[PDB]
């Protein structure tokens, strides 16, 4: 039960931009060897790796563990794989933390990647990670769930007449964060006006698809002094899983948790509340301790996560976003690197993208820096809350 | 075609998958527990609430109302076999017995009639063709008006 | 006393106005198709509809009148069958979930497949091999009609299911008479998608096939029953067009009052095997007890089925709570010719599709 | 009065192709497996000028020749390899027989059980008194609808059988029947496809979900209706795509091999399709004595099954006194190499539009 | 801290197919049977480590939450492992770290393979190599083992005894499986040696089937509540090497001291390295081993016994020919029948090894090594692309 | 076919995969490290021995000897696109530079000449057709005498 | 070079098989094979002011072994000028490679200074005529070279069933579930 610290974290820049020239093996080496350089450590010093991608159906490449190890040239160091939608990296990070905390491995590398251009149309493939017999094979995409989830939230929480404004305000705030973050895909672009964003596609809340690989180096606490001046520790993390089927959100007898709201729906993610409550208790903090956070953003799905994370009351996330509360001077800065709207989004690499910005935030290195930040939390979901990962990081 | 050269395909579906799911897709069959009478859909082997192995097939209510709906008009997200109909009306259907089914609404005679909470009934329709050339049939929902 | 216990019908909602087909192809006169033939619009099969989809709907609607019915026999009559090997009636039986132990097969003889399957079910119940039987006549003529064909403007689809039994009969089965021959007026060889004509469309083609077999079957049943056209309150013919029953009536000695109750295809077109059965449904929907009905259907490659019915007094209690076929035909969606060709998969697209739009 | 089979006839192609000829070309299966376990040493080849209607009318005519001056009241053709997808092929055979025009006519299709399904329909017509007699035909050209290189190509064949149901001079009485069906797409052919396709890899796993289940359900269902056990029946007849299949089903259903052997015929014919259960019944009827009890159970994929029980009457002795046995008919055979067989059954990928015969 | 296995079970006859049940039903069968053996309620599980070949078989991806809901343990997390034949071997090592880290006290570890959901599962198998240079070129895993067998016998002068060695190895698996009730080849008569030499693959061909298996891991101090005789985990090692079959002969990427200069397919450099790391971590040498489990297919068993340190380079054939892997032999191998006799589901294979060792250390195996205090599982994925060595002792 | 209904396919290969690998598959290009002069195949970004990112492409020797061979005669293990040639002769080819390639032998004119240590040369042949309908070509080996 | 619209053999777009515009025979050869070949050769010789007797070797289209000899007899070339170029006795119609493969077999035995006349025929219809002179460098070239004839000795025999199978001439399923299903 020893402490684990993050000595380094890096990912390929512009994750919302495709990297059609390099193979996924080239892409993975790039992010890892840049992170190893930051930690002043040799690649041979890694004793094992926990990596993650969507599944063998994209690049038609299965059992990827040994190929990753050989690609990095750390053979015979093992590589542990995780295939869990957008939380593939978040689960790979949690796996690596358990590998170092167990004392079986002293230095581990945890990352995720998504090389979507290897598939002709990657958007059709995505649905293969659900209750495929009753949704994928029926023509139900993952984007459908987020579209319906956004609809139920606005409709049952009295946001009629303000739906376009809330989505555009969140999307605009993501552009503002991403304009000055050099690793963001929307970096350097002008900020569209609020009225322009409401007329754009998905009212400005559509994410930027792309490709990226990222990784973070975890080391035992006593070994951390050799590799980093300012280490970031892991207070606590939780991972939870419920049925992939979208219908079970409203009716979930399998899920067992206390205090869950009676009116569970797509707008009120029951699994997301459970995962947050487990992680907070395990990390020894309440929601009032978070100085900066990172959530999965797509249409109104960001609003649902803020309420499940305890940032604001049920039905209040929209008004919170409208009041500039997730701005840098707002009550809680949210997705300070630009999020999936501005930074970009690769499903396999999403978890590391969250840790990296939180990692930079707790070391004062973020481009939009929360003054005196001590606690950083990453909220991530796979599928539609079928997976859910909440990770808590502190700087001291 | 004219050159019968086999083309590479990683995954070919066996008839067994849909054969075991004829009850679930054709007749909207879920599962009910004998101890606590809790109902689920899709079918499951283990009860969730009391965690009993004793679970039996259950015919879900074929009538229901629309809990939430969202049109699918984006052509980038058009799936093979479903690109002919634009737009597809995705909706979560709250059946009469309380269960919620994720499906789509078809045969919208009156656009004004379709709204949140409108009554619908289950129908059987054609879906994407199987990888083994067999026609796939499964449920959809139409407005019960 | 064995006859029809209940019935149900299935119709596609999408409609294509006849003028749309003429403006693209310009292959026939609009006045002839609308006024002489009597079809102003036809039903468009959606991408997710076929014989089984429409068929199981009509079967489910017939069985809903008899709750908890156990299926003892199910015969699917279709010439546009989705499977050339293996029976689709097995799939419909699975969808109904009313039991596995049942006589099951696919009957096919062009437009008389529906009635031919009705004769199967009648024989099973009358011979005591089963206590009840389900007959389904369905066809997707619009799917199996080539673009540019003269008959494209009035090719449609439909399904009709009738449950044969001895309990609570609404229309008795008095007797039947059937005939056949080798008259290649219309043929679809194995592997062909589209039904093709054996000769030019016209009165000459109707006299040797449609009118010949219909007259022989109708006469054969009437002579067996010692009845004349004047004894029947309604007559029901094959109804690829509205003109076909009226034209057949004048040829057979029936009056227009005897045909009009069966006319339904003004906005549907050629429903294939279902047209004689859908016409019977439109008649049974407003019939009074005791009335006599004569049904004669025509299937090409030709033969004909003649069936005589008597409406029982139980028809009153049946119609009290039921949706008539005329009301079912009110629900319609309109599409242009471009959409109709897309829905019915009549664009020459790539054999192997990489993505849906590529 | 008792209603049952009055006469029967069969039509089988004369061309034969040794199984080894197919294996040497494709090398896709073990020769010992097919010849010894499966029991097919050679299969029937379809000539260019014969098909379902050719074999059907030949089988139909041969049965009607036993009843001179007969008038046809109903004719049903049961086949899953139908030459016409629209219009009834049975109407053509009716015209060829020239024994009457006024007859109940249709095409019945349910894979391998189309023959018995048509047999059941003819029985219902006569027993219900809707007709005085009825003619049922089970025919198929499986070899024509089996692709080259298919695992089942080496034992794919063709054949036709016809049975006359009547109430006068019955040689085999029709006691009772039982049928079941389900959606088990173990083998399927969609509309427009020429070749029958499999739903899963061949094996005992594929057999257990379709062939074994539907045959067992139909058999046990019928025997419970008559309150009889496997020991009551003198002969049993199953689907006979392979010689191994009737034996395997008997072992599964509890019939000793002696009840199966009289029905075996397909050692040199291969999969005869819808005619295999009827052809097996014919080889039984050629040698049966009066009083013997026959249990026939058929199988059609996309699965359903038909079970029928028969009793042999005293008229069988007069019938076979002047009759050609099916076993005698199976001796007439012409052998071809694989090259000729592919040419005869139109399996070479030739030009869509042919200017001359060889150009 | 120490972890102990309180129960381990798998669906019977793994070499035979279960076409009637879905993969969810199959996973629940082994899981809830294992819970009954350990006298523990299913809601007591805090996390799961399961494994399957890949999302391509049943077209089911992101399987974690589906497993948790299938078992009815939500919101308990399920950590997925997709690493060829060692999917269960890798997943067991994942659960060991979850319990040893203290983040979870009770963890369920297993694997499954539902091969019948794929029309032709064999041609899909190659999807887990260096796909561009072997899968897409028509080179399968089965090609690798056939070549490796050919190089072994040819490099070590076994010419003329190849059919005898494979049949002797194969027949020993048949003899072991006959009295093992859960084995697929259970209760069958023993074919003669000469019959096996003329049979397919000289009798060394494995039995393809489907199965689900699982084992319960619990912290040492909690183990006494659930079982009377727990089995501990001395040490485990996992190593990764290039999937490409050519790299066995020339792999400067693999850095491990003391490797023989004649590395190839007959001498697995990765399997030696993995064995040495596990033996050091468990604090035992090869002479300590009382019973072992290998991935048996063609002569791959022979190579694995040598890489495991049981016999010198080239002795396995002569070792097997001298009846060394028999029950009375110096070291019994695959006492449950192995992949040839028990059967094998690729994802489920790691648990199939552990269960027999788990049973052997408790004196419960049908072919029981008397006084076995240690058991070792050798498992490989691809052709030694993965290699997993787990050491279990009862003291 | 005559019914152009989309058929389900989970994976459709992008042309990018084979595009980046033309050097490896057409020209047998591996990787060579500049600092320590070690060569590998297939191509790689990181050198294994010295762990330097300075790596460059390398044209492997297209001649070599047969190190070990095994016929593939089993029809159960026949893969789509490769079922026409039976039996395929699988072989490990020790290139003249010391590297080992896994491929197959074709064009066996004389059976007696095919034994271990026989000299072979690389040739370009057609392989399984791509999921994107593009023909696929890659290397094979024939006896070099 | 010369050309015209003579549809003696055509393959329309989307057709796999080459089709004949008329029945095979000497009449079909005169309007296409014989006309265009004569026109191109006579046109070239008139440009070069040479006669058939000046060339040591002549190379024609070699769909068949008979075609160059018959064309030579027609155009006035004695057999010895043709025989070196013949190779297709065991190959068949090699298509576009037949004039080039004939030249290779000639160059394998040619001496410096010898004159070669190559006239090829492509249906549909057209003919290309090319005249060559052998340089002194051929002697050095042939010192280390595998001749065409030696390469043509390597062959593997198959029956008709396999040949049809190898060339994908069986009518198989459009969509193949497995290799043999
Ligand atoms: O698995 C995924 C789900 C989703 O909604 C988006 C995406 O890019 C991947
Ligand atoms: Zn319960
Ligand atoms: Zn180097």
Author numbering:
A (entry chain O): 3 to 398
B (entry chain N), F (entry chain E): 2 to 146
C (entry chain A): 5 to 362
D (entry chain D): 4 to 362
E (entry chain F): 4 to 398
G (entry chain J): 182 to 362
From the paper:
A bacterial multicomponent acyltransferase from Pseudomonas protegens (PpATase) catalyzes such Friedel–Crafts C‐acylation of phenolic substrates in aqueous solution, reaching up to >99 % conversion without the need for CoA‐activated reagents. We determined X‐ray crystal structures of the native and ligand‐bound complexes. This multimeric enzyme consists of three subunits: PhlA, PhlB, and PhlC, arranged in a Phl(A2C2)2B4 composition. Very recently, the scope of applications has been extended to phlACB, which encodes the cofactor‐independent acyltransferase PpATase referred to above. This catalyzes the reversible disproportionation of 1‐(2,4,6‐trihydroxyphenyl)ethanone (monoacetylphloroglucinol, MAPG) into PG and DAPG in a divergent reaction. The composition of the multimeric enzyme complex is thus best described as Phl(A2C2)2B4, in which the four copies of PhlB mediate the binding of two PhlA and two PhlC dimers to form the complete oligomer.
Orthorhombic crystals of PpATase were soaked with the native acetyl donor/acceptor MAPG, and the structure of the complex was solved at 3.4 Å resolution. The orthogonal crystals, on the other hand, contain two copies of the full dodecamer in the asymmetric unit. Residual density was observed in the vicinity of residue Cys88 in four out of the eight crystallographically independent copies of the PhlC subunit. This density was compatible with an acetylated Cys88 residue and with a (deacetylated) PG molecule bound at this site. The resulting structure revealed that only residues from PhlC interact with the bound PG. Specifically, the side chains of His56 and of Tyr124 and His347 form hydrogen bonds with the hydroxy groups at positions 1 and 3, respectively, of the aromatic ring. In contrast, the hydroxy group at position 5 is apparently not involved in any direct interactions with PhlC. Instead, it points towards a small cavity lined by mostly hydrophobic residues (such as Phe148, Leu209, and Leu300). The carbonyl oxygen atom of the Cys88‐bound acetyl group is positioned in the “oxyanion hole” of the α/β‐hydrolase‐type fold forming hydrogen bonds with the main‐chain amide groups of Cys88 itself and of Gly385. The acetyl group is oriented more or less parallel to the aromatic ring, and its carbonyl carbon atom is appropriately positioned for an electrophilic attack on the C‐6 atom of the substrate, with distances between the two atoms ranging from 3 to 3.5 Å.
